[PDB]
Amino acid sequence: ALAGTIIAGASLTFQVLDKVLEELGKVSRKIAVGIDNESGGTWTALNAYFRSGTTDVILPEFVPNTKALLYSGRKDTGPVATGAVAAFAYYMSSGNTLGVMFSVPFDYNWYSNWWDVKIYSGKRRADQGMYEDLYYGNPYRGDNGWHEKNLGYGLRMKGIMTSAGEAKMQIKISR
Numbered sequence: 001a002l003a004g005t006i007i008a009g010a011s012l013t014f015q016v017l018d019k020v021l022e023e024l025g026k027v028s029r030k031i032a033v034g035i036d037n038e039s040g041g042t043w044t045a046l047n048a049y050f051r052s053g054t055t056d057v058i059l060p061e062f063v064p065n066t067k068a069l070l071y072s073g074r075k076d077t078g079p080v081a082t083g084a085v086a087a088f089a090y091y092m093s094s095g096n097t098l099g100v101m102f103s104v105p106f107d108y109n110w111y112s113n114w115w116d117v118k119i120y121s122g123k124r125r126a127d128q129g130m131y132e133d134l135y136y137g138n139p140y141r142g143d144n145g146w147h148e149k150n151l152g153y154g155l156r157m158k159g160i161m162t163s164a165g166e167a168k169m170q171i172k173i174s175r
């Protein structure tokens with residue numbers, strides 16, 4: 001497939017991400033994630049914690065500089081009113097952890113899509129704690145808009161997440 005795989009950073013596109021959503025099949029709530037690594041060094045998968053939903057693939061174990069990782073997620077199958085929400089992390093060659101969060105609620109009635117990235121000192125794994133850290137911190141909304149910011153440690157991040165049941169999220173970490 002495409003998810004659980006890495007590709008040349010330069011080739012990461014919305015087209016690539018939408019094709020990821022396709023392989024997930026007709027499921028009302030899903031997300032396809034793409035992260036381009038341009039930090040200067042390699043990344044190593046730590047883990048993924050799902051608040052809601054689940055995933056069908058593995059976190060690309062290795063992400064070398066200039067390469068982009070591909071990942072996906074979705075709500076639980078069946079008559080269950082739930083979305084796709086989680087946080088996952090990658091260990092960096094600088095010795096710090098990169099943390100990512102995405103939330104795609106079941107009922108877009110009251111709720112919306114939310115996401116964020118953050119770098120944790122040392123080595124930390126994704127948990128209900130990191131999830132709450134990014135969710136209830138100051139996450140970006142999946143407003144189909146691009147956002148950027150300084151990640152500290154001299155990295156900077158550029159990103160975007162769509163606002164809908166079948167979402168796509170594209171991020172980039174530069175040095």
Ligand SMILES: C[N+](C)(C)CCOP(=O)(O)O
Binds near residue numbers: 052085103
């Ligand atoms: C919508 N959600 C239940 C997945 C996230 C938590 O929302 P809230 O209980 O803080 O308002």
